[PDB]
């Protein structure tokens, strides 16, 4: 495929280690966002070939999506919660730098981001 390979989602030799914050990120934050009615454009990598977006991956240096984040959480890929939070932030940034302000997708991202940030403001210690 002419799309980039998807981001890595498992680390073969990394120990399995939970934290309160990582449990929250999976079981509260990702759970809530995945089921939101506006989640679907964000549930998988952007398929720029299928969407005929030849400049998407020129504009977006660090692709990220909730499908990747979900797998990373399930596979205990993240060493800490901040890494996961950064991936969410990157996902939203990508949407806002590529898509025109006021496009449907942007309003959808804004609703998801608001919900995300409301949950992060209640992150455990």
């Amino acid at each position: 495929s002419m799309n980039p390979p998807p981001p890595e989602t498992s680390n073969p030799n990394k120990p399995k280690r939970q934290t309160n914050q990582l449990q929250y990120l999976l079981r509260v934050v990702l759970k809530t966002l995945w089921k939101h009615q506006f989640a679907w454009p964000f549930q998988q990598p952007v398929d720029a070939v299928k969407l005929n977006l030849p400049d998407y991956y020129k504009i977006i240096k660090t692709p990220m999506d909730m499908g990747t984040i979900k797998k990373r959480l399930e596979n205990n890929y993240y060493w800490n919660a901040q890494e996961c939070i950064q991936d969410f932030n990157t996902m939203f940034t990508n949407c806002y730098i590529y898509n025109k302000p006021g496009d449907d997708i942007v309003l959808m991202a804004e609703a998801l981001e608001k919900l995300f940030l409301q949950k992060i403001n209640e992150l455990p210690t």
Partner: peptide, 10 residues
């Protein structure tokens, strides 16, 4: 780059 398609129902 090119706009994405229609995504919500108004």
């Amino acid at each position: 780059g090119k706009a994405k398609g229609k995504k919500t129902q108004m």
